[PDB]
Symmetry: D2
Subunit: 265 residues, 4 copies
């Protein structure tokens, strides 16, 4: 009755928290991890992990899957491998929960068709923090009243992808309600290239990468003589662990790909 | 077919904008104003108002009402008179739209029973700005996920009432979903009296009064390793005029008191 | 003993405030304005301006200067003409105060050499609001402690130039103290072009253009487990008028170009 | 040549970080800790601390001091004991570095006279984070331009003292430059008691206590049509450890009490 869980990227900043979270969830067993550095046969061979953590380490996902057959694979690796990892899972009977960001629209859609076809649950979560999920949800609603919006998204300066998964997802959600259009004066000029940020269906997105930050976003809706702002700030990686636990549990109940936890609160 | 509108406090910071707004609404006639300073027979006798504004001035509301019989009275006066003004209207066949803040819970409830009994529309709007209304609406929803919240509310330093009407209304709305409780360590001490702010069913409220501000609020919901924030900023009094126009129109369609525009977007 | 002042762009959002400000300064006479639309011989012929404002209108700056010989020309026009306007002034004996933004580094330096050579005062003010000036000043100082910084700069959506004059000036000031370097992970990728903003000596700058905004900036300095933020918000164009008055006065006391009011508080 | 350091409150949220920081500073030896719970003879007997941490535990400060004679005592305990602890140190030849908040003005002044008289260094640091120190420093300067200011100060909801040490110190600093006065309309009324916050020489202070927060402050200076804001956010307790290390080092160089690290950057 335990959910048998494998994790990708156990030594990472998210990885190790999720290792501990899964170790201490009483309805979940951590049955394996995937790395890409030889760090021994068992995760207990690493420092940062105690001797009790006799979890087998694999350097090859296909090997992990065939040897261990986990119910769920939680990916917290890098954008470079996210698609390949998810795909391997989805055609070898493993439910992926993907924390990792940096799918393409096309790859996400391909993953969605694979889950559909194999009747297999998958969660792609751009943010595990419940306040972030709430932010996104309210963005959809606010977009109805305020068609002009921008997104500013801020993270630690080791983050590899800009804009962030959350900002992409926010913008998609907004884009469904908001009529497509450009903002700013039609004749504005950027005299320093990049100033006005990225653009998603006309919605500007700006990305901040500084030391000290963890994960933050604000959504600014302009109106008549006023500004409505939605904001979320995660101050540490523990803010994500309830979402991770919720996602492992939730993925078992579905037979298709769910993109974003907003759908299933 | 015109809505016949009288306004209380026409020379005030809100008053004069609403005078202009009502003058330029094509489905509304400004049929009278109420002051408490002798400023002449007609509002056109005041500077700030053009010669075209031949709107009769009254210093007595009962006189105004009996002489003019407006469909609607828009009050933008002071907390000192708000109750008396609303009550006079509600038992002389006039729909009040009350911008003015500073009713007591008891007075609001008395006003609500009078409207009910006289089958007469009344809107009490703690904020006319649509982003503010949206803020309040989302506060209710957010309160379900985050029971610990505080409100910080900021206005120009001529404002007479603290906390603000909006902050009261926000807190009421939150209080319906949020279990009643105290926040902060149970043994915390205030060593400078007032630090921890006012309290509404355990919800702290803090009020900022500075030059330069117009009207602003933020709502801070604490959670695990994170903070979810809802914010609205009105940068001028024109931000309120769509709400005022919406309220005059909406009041004509109802036969009871509506508290807050959230109900009727 | 009156400062004889001419203004460029009198009907503009800044222009008209500055018209009124200069009209009501008792040590200043508004002796002319420059437009580029035929709006009559006198500014009093325009609506928005009262009959008392018998200020001659010119459509040609050289004509204005030769006819009127103002002590000072206050430019609040457009980036397209700023350089040409300043230059005409600086070689016809007129002190320019330039509110208008959008000089190039090269044009600014050319203007600085012209003022030097003609012993003629000139102020180029990227922001007239004293809190903005203070923000910039503190940015220099903060940069010593926190080498990693980003600038987010927000304005109404009729603004023509991005990034803003203030953000350029902020970055220049920072750049003098901050060692030149790139921020963000060295391998970060922008998967939506523009996300990470413009770059000034490695300092990111992001520009927000929404309805309802007037002028706003924040400066974010990342550090160990923390973030230091400097912020300024102008909520209307009156926030600039003390700076404008200060600049007209100050320009008379100098014999070279001053870039930014920080130098001369 | 090592600084011999004892710490009060080693198991606390600050305490344990400072234990690790001091253990890993190569010019410092942790020679003792003070608790008030019997947790064994050595700190290594506690979990959270490794076997290598053979640091003697004392339950009595006087005993600690006479037995160990540390150069420096770092207090991270509770407001209840702060004064007593500092005083014991200052008349038994030990330099106190006091992280703990909640001295009275009178107790602080008494401590300052004791240090003076015994020619003994003491640092009372209301914030160890360098951005906080910078915030305070800039507050003094900003106060010259903007006499109307409020302070909002936000911390986790286990914090015992409100307002915070930092907010007290900020206000003191401001109060030296700012003319003493009340803010807000002179006739404003609080209809919910506490709304307008605490008052320090007329300066309002508001205190927020929520889960998820660590330590945060903003300082809001109102002006003409504008607002200047100084802000600092500590996102974890590691943000304080450079300040702690700096303070142990700095205290050795002084022969009197220094209140706030602003003096000695
Ligand atoms: N959804 C959310 O709520 C959320 C929250 C936080 C982060 N994230 C995302 O999650 C990902 C992880 O972030 P992070 O900050 O934890 O990054 P991180 O600290 O870089 O950790 C990534 C880990 O994956 C390892 N790794 C890299 N390639 C691998 C492979 N092919 N197989 C196995 N392991 C591999 C890395 O090892 P080496 O260091 O040895 O390369 C590292 O231990 C990012 O994409 C980020 O955007 C999402
Ligand atoms: N719901 C919202 O969205 C919203 C927005 C803004 C303001 N408000 C509220 O609306 C009220 C007005 O704010 P404000 O800033 O406009 O205040 P204001 O500028 O003080 O204007 C109040 C006006 O009412 C006049 N007045 C006072 N007592 C009166 C009486 N008995 N009869 C007739 N006129 C009277 C005043 O004249 P004297 O100056 O001669 O006394 C003044 O012209 C306040 O309660 C405020 O909280 C609500
Ligand atoms: N330093 C500061 O503190 C500060 C503050 C605010 C704004 N600004 C800057 O000041 C400039 C003005 O901003 P704004 O919002 O006032 O713009 P605006 O409302 O567009 O006004 C510009 C005015 O200049 C007129 N104009 C354009 N070309 C002209 C020419 N060749 N000769 C004479 N008049 C001309 C325009 O008339 P038409 O509309 O007929 O073209 C308009 O009336 C911008 O560059 C902005 O960045 C600076
Ligand atoms: N200056 C700064 O930068 C800064 C930063 C953070 C915190 N602080 C301040 O530092 C203090 C500590 O904060 P915190 O969050 O670490 O509090 P904490 O987690 O409550 O820790 C206090 C520690 O002191 C212990 N303690 C209580 N009374 C004691 C006594 N008489 N002798 C020895 N130990 C005692 C407590 O043990 P029990 O739990 O067993 O009672 C606890 O382990 C607070 O006053 C806070 O305001 C200052
Ligand atoms: O939206 C995202 O991409 C995201 C969300 C939380 C954390 C991180 C991260 O640490 O990179 N990234
Ligand atoms: O909530 C309120 O009480 C409120 C809302 C907008 C403006 C004002 C005001 O100007 O006083 N007050
Ligand atoms: O820094 C700037 O460029 C600036 C500053 C204030 C106002 C404006 C504007 O309204 O465009 N622009
Ligand atoms: O100013 C203060 O009192 C302060 C500063 C940092 C942290 C804390 C705390 O955690 O209580 N308190």
């Amino acid at each position: 009755m335990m959910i048998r869980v494998a994790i990708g990227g156990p030594r990472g900043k998210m990885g190790q928290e999720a290792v501990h979270t899964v170790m201490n969830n009483e309805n979940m067993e951590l049955v394996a991890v995937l790395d890409h550095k030889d760090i021994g046969d068992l995760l207990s061979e690493s420092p940062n992990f105690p001797a009790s953590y006799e979890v087998p380490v694999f350097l090859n996902l296909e090997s992990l899957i065939v040897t261990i057959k986990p119910d769920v694979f939680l990916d917290l690796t890098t954008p470079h491998q996210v698609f390949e990892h998810t795909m391997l899972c989805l055609q070898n009977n493993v439910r992926p929960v993907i924390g990792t960001t940096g799918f393409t629209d096309e790859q996400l859609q391909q993953c969605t068709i694979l889950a559909e076809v194999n009747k297999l649950g998958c969660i792609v979560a751009p943010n595990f923090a419940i306040g972030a999920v709430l932010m996104m949800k309210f963005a959809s609603l606010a977009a109805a009243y305020f068609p002009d919006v921008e997104i500013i998204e801020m993270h630690h300066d080791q983050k590899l992808d800009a804009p962030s998964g959350t900002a992409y997802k926010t913008a998609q959600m907004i884009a469904e309600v908001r009529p497509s259009h450009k903002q700013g004066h039609p004749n504005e000029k950027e005299t320093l290239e990049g100033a006005r940020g990225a653009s998603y269906d006309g919605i500007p997105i700006h990305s901040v990468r500084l030391p000290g930050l963890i994960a933050h976003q604000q959504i600014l809706f302009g109106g008549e003589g006023q500004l409505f702002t939605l904001r979320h700030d995660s101050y540490n990686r523990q803010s994500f662990m309830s979402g991770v636990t919720f996602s492992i549990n939730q993925v078992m109940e579905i037979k298709e790909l769910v993109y974003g936890l907003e759908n299933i609160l």
